[PDB]
Amino acid sequence: AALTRNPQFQKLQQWHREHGSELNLRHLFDTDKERFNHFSLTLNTNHGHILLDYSKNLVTEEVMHMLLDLAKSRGVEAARESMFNGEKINSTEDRAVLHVALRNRSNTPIVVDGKDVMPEVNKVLDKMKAFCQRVRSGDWKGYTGKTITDVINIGIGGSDLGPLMVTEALKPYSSGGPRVWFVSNIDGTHIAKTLACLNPESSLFIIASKTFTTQETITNAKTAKDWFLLSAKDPSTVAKHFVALSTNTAKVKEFGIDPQNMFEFWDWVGGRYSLWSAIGLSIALHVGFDNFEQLLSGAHWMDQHFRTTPLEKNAPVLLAMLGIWYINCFGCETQAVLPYDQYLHRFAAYFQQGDMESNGKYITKSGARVDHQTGPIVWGEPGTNGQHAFYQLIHQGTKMIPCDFLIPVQTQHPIRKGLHHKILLANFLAQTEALMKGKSTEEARKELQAAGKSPEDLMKLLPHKVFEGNRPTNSIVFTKLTPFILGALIAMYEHKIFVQGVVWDINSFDQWGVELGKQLAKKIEPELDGSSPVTSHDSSTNGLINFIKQQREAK
Amino acid sequence: AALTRNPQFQKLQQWHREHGSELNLRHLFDTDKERFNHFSLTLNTNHGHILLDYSKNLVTEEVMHMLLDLAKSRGVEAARESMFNGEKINSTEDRAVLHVALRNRSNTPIVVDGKDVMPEVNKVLDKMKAFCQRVRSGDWKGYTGKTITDVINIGIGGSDLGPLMVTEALKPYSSGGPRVWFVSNIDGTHIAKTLACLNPESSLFIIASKTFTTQETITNAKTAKDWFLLSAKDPSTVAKHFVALSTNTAKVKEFGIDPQNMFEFWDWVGGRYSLWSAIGLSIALHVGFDNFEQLLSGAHWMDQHFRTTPLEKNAPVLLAMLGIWYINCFGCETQAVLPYDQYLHRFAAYFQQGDMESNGKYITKSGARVDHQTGPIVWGEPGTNGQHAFYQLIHQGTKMIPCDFLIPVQTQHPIRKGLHHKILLANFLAQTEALMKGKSTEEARKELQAAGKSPEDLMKLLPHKVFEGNRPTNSIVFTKLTPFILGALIAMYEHKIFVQGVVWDINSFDQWGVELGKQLAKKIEPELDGSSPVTSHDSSTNGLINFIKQQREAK
Numbered sequence A, B: 001a002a003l004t005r006n007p008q009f010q011k012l013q014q015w016h017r018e019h020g021s022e023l024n025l026r027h028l029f030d031t032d033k034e035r036f037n038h039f040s041l042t043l044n045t046n047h048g049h050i051l052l053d054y055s056k057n058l059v060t061e062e063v064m065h066m067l068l069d070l071a072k073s074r075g076v077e078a079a080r081e082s083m084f085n086g087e088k089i090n091s092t093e094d095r096a097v098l099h100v101a102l103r104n105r106s107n108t109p110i111v112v113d114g115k116d117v118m119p120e121v122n123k124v125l126d127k128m129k130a131f132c133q134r135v136r137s138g139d140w141k142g143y144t145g146k147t148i149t150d151v152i153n154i155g156i157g158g159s160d161l162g163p164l165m166v167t168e169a170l171k172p173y174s175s176g177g178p179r180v181w182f183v184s185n186i187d188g189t190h191i192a193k194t195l196a197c198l199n200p201e202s203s204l205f206i207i208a209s210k211t212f213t214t215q216e217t218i219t220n221a222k223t224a225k226d227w228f229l230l231s232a233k234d235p236s237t238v239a240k241h242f243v244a245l246s247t248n249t250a251k252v253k254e255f256g257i258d259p260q261n262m263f264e265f266w267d268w269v270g271g272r273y274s275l276w277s278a279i280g281l282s283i284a285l286h287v288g289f290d291n292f293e294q295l296l297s298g299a300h301w302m303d304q305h306f307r308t309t310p311l312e313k314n315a316p317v318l319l320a321m322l323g324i325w326y327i328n329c330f331g332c333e334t335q336a337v338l339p340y341d342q343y344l345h346r347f348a349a350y351f352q353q354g355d356m357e358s359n360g361k362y363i364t365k366s367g368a369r370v371d372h373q374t375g376p377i378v379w380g381e382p383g384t385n386g387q388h389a390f391y392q393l394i395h396q397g398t399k400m401i402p403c404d405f406l407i408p409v410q411t412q413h414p415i416r417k418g419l420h421h422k423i424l425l426a427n428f429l430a431q432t433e434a435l436m437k438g439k440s441t442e443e444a445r446k447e448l449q450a451a452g453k454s455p456e457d458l459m460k461l462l463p464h465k466v467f468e469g470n471r472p473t474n475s476i477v478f479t480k481l482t483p484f485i486l487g488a489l490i491a492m493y494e495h496k497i498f499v500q501g502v503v504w505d506i507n508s509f510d511q512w513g514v515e516l517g518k519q520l521a522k523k524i525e526p527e528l529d530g531s532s533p534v535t536s537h538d539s540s541t542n543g544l545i546n547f548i549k550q551q552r553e554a555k
Ligand SMILES: O=C(O)[C@@H](O)[C@H](O)[C@H](O)COP(=O)(O)O
Pocket: A156, A157, A158, A159, A208, A209, A210, A211, A212, A213, A214, A217, A270, A271, A272, A357, A511, A514, B388, B389
């Protein structure tokens, strides 16, 4: 792999094996009153400020220099320009990677195969707004004349999680916007419980599928139409209750959807980076197009920051290299994302896909097997809830877990004159401080010495109440969680993922494991029918199939 | 630490060092036709069957034997008996650990401090039933004479996640029950968006708090009460709209709730193991007491199985030891929980708390610091969705990730004549099969050749489409996800967590990190008031606070 033989990488590993374990956060702060000033980054977007405080990390000026040197020796900047210019960096599928073009508000041309893609990008956007306007104003009528009250997005993976996470995060910006629903799982329970609360006459279905062949989505779409053609009767009506977001016109029309009701995107739009395209139609419908453009504008601002800022002060690059440090040097398997915001309850899950599906690879772009770790397992839940649960292991477990704490300064609901948000902010701050500082045996002893216990009882309990600390965290604070700021935050992590993939020299934009998945079920599906036992697979698969057949009708 | 000094552990460790990396699933199944039969366990509960297929694990008869020898020499059985008999095994807080008493349907006596605890357990249950009957039947009236249409649980951590996850999992059994809401985060958004959809006259609040002092819960409770009184005006009406689940009679009275409206539990009821107690009131209100008793009965059945079954055929013990194998021998940091069931969408999150908060420890019961790994990071999302996202990393990443795949044979929504469930089952089966088998270079090469790829195209794509497989999984299949089966499944994992805790010799029932967290914020809260900069903390904490103060004014 290109990595382990890289001089800057070897230098970093050499340094870590000699000083890595010695680094102590509490000691670093107690010996450098300027640590925060030197290890933090403030970004004025003109639409709110974003503070990236990466000072509670196990790094020194020297470490950061070695990390930035590695990013440079690995060609991060050149790779970046290649993506922004529309080059087919997605080598395995021979495609460009242009989610950045989807939000290119500057409209600077980006040529992909002879012609600029911006014109078609803006055309779909205009088509989206036009359609969105008709639905919102009550202009677009249902087959019996009523206005649409519910919009149901049907899709899975990249055609589901982005719009879901964003609509959830931007709920405060949904007006005369119809209710939005997200059906994704093939599990019948999903569409069933969703359709049970809907009126066919005022429900609009959005079939989101890049390829338009995914079994879960097409099956759910067909079931939804049957449920519709049910109370409706007559297939000419569908045209007023079903629209599509895809890149395959034939398949769409083949399903029964007119060309005018298809909002397309392109192959250079990865599912996990598609909410910025037609896929985000449910977002626009929910919060309006002005807010959707703000979302796009926020990402564009971050794209520019990432493209024009010196690596040393580049947000996504810093986040990426700190990750490299923990992954490749400390060997941390995971990365926690902890938003202190209820609206962002699907945020960690969104990047669990975005990150893991992008960098969960073991083959370099040249085809060589990596001999180092790649993408981490991303996970998390919004705080303060986690502080009462899994933070126990973060504080006193045997695993090093880098954590990104995020929070907006201003809340969308300043109830009780801000009492709730004040407490939320206090916990946000106190937790990272405690993870860094911990509580020594002596501090715990003195505290217990005041309990009136005694050397017998103080003794049995003391070690259990000691916190070794030295748990690294990043604190990301922003003025307010608005459509613009959310867009910037998402783009920030998209680029963090990009930078790491470059360092590891893998293809962060293909997903052969996901493609594999869409073909695996076909063989087993027909074998499930009937009570006759199956013996064509390994004994476990056979045994499970036979248990299923046996229990299928059990009362 | 006791583990590393254990003879059976060293033997296991030695064996792993000399052959561990040689184990290959595909080869193990290819050479053994009886593998499934030899590495699977069927449980007939008389209320559905549960098949635990652990054959797709990197183990042989010899490994399982060594693992079981370890469970025995680490005293699992004696520890189990100590828990069931009411001994105060929670050494640090000097408390018993009796969630098993909460669901002890057999009513066999459990002496705790000379007094059988069952009479009190059953008294609260009867009280819970009488109350829920009044509420559900409409007997219980609001301050204006209306029946209760919405029940709102206010609590956090152990006083929130269990009831939330169970009510979600058992939605099909909620007919005739009022709508249930869960408010937990201190973040004002949570209660504000909840109260916005409620009518004070028909809303009943349940304040769930073992201590009744947790800041998030009490603050949320006070906000709800203020909201309520804004309409009811008369504070004497609170008695008809507020009840409490707690162990602190004094604080409950202090809040303003009368004794007869307090459903109690005890100190030996850990929050993360409390849904079986009064904390489960919202569950009973949602699905009825018969269903709630079935839930308890399922757990009781699993408790008996765990207590009376020889280790070798003991479900929780097997799951626990397989985990020890991956954690202490293979060094895997995480454990994925993947339920192929939309109703179980919060199941993984529930055990993320139950497992991590229990075993995320680094101090043994003797006070020694562990010199080995303890609890893993637990995570996951329902299937099939994950297949289109993070499964990419599980299939082609650089991390070994044990996965538990769960699914009910019979669905609660057999729509389309069972088509949706058929596909779900096929995916469940094919995924574990592929994780095990993978796809060699030869197999991938043949496919590319069959697809008509040129030597060039095939050469450049080939490596990227290869799957090394050998990814271990457990497949847990049950007849149907009923209240009883859900209860058995939860209790099963509760005991897996218990067994591992005994092997590691840690206290799986305290949570000093969680206790610490509930006091950390108090110092910073008052410091946020005002515009003057703070300098009483480390430079990072100081800088963040000052950024917050500066941006508090930004418009
Ligand atoms: O990330 C991917 O590439 C997958 O999650 C896809 O988004 C998901 O399978 C949907 O594919 P499609 O939009 O073609 O239906």
